[PDB]
């Protein structure tokens, strides 16, 4: 699709057998989602860095469908004010900024 | 241009008679820039909201050039970890997400 930016670019995603919504965020390096139960291995990762750090669980090579596009990428799972699709997964779906 | 997202989408901007760099950030509603001296009227605005609020100066209808596109929009001026072009100015330049 071509998504204009008059509203927040929120899309539907399928992850870990659940339907969720997340924000396509070109300002975020990484993808961070809350309340998903993923199978398979993880390691803790420290993110943010303002006021302290936030610890999340890093899952690598996670299958995820983003607005109909089935891809694979790292997903960080933990508390986040908004579910965020970062650049790491936007590259996978072939998402570009155009003007 | 068409900008792929393997790296941070940092572009050159002209504002307040200065050349600066800023991040095209679809996760940000507003544009926030540090160390610019804009002429004309402003009002304080509270932004963020995590850990407290941050107070910035809101300047309306500011002429700004973003990657060669001369537009007009609101610019918040205050210390920010990275200069950010928000959706408010990405709409002005006709920037879309495409995949």
């Amino acid at each position: 699709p071509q998504i204009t930016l008059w509203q927040r670019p929120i899309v539907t995603i399928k992850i870990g057998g659940q339907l969720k919504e997340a924000l396509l965020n070109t300002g975020a390096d990484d993808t961070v989602l809350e309340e998903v139960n993923l199978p398979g291995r993880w390691k803790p990762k420290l993110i943010g860095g303002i006021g302290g750090f936030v610890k999340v669980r890093q899952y690598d090579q996670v299958p995820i469908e983003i607005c109909g596009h089935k891809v694979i990428g790292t997903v960080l799972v933990g508390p986040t004010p908004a579910n965020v699709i970062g650049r790491n997964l936007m590259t996978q779906i072939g998402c570009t900024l155009n003007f | 241009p068409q900008i792929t997202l393997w790296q941070r989408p940092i572009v050159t901007i002209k504002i307040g008679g200065q050349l600066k760099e800023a991040l095209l950030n679809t996760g940000a509603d507003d544009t926030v820039l540090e160390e610019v001296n804009l002429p004309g009227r402003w009002k304080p605005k509270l932004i963020g909201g995590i850990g407290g609020f941050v107070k910035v100066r809101q300047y309306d209808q500011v002429p700004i050039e973003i990657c060669g596109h001369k537009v007009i929009g609101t610019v918040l001026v205050g210390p920010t970890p990275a200069n950010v072009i928000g959706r408010n100015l990405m709409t002005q330049i006709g920037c879309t997400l495409n995949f």
Partner: peptide, 7 residues
């Protein structure tokens, strides 16, 4: 809200 982010 306003949303840049690096670990």
């Amino acid at each position: 809200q306003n949303y840049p982010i690096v670990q």
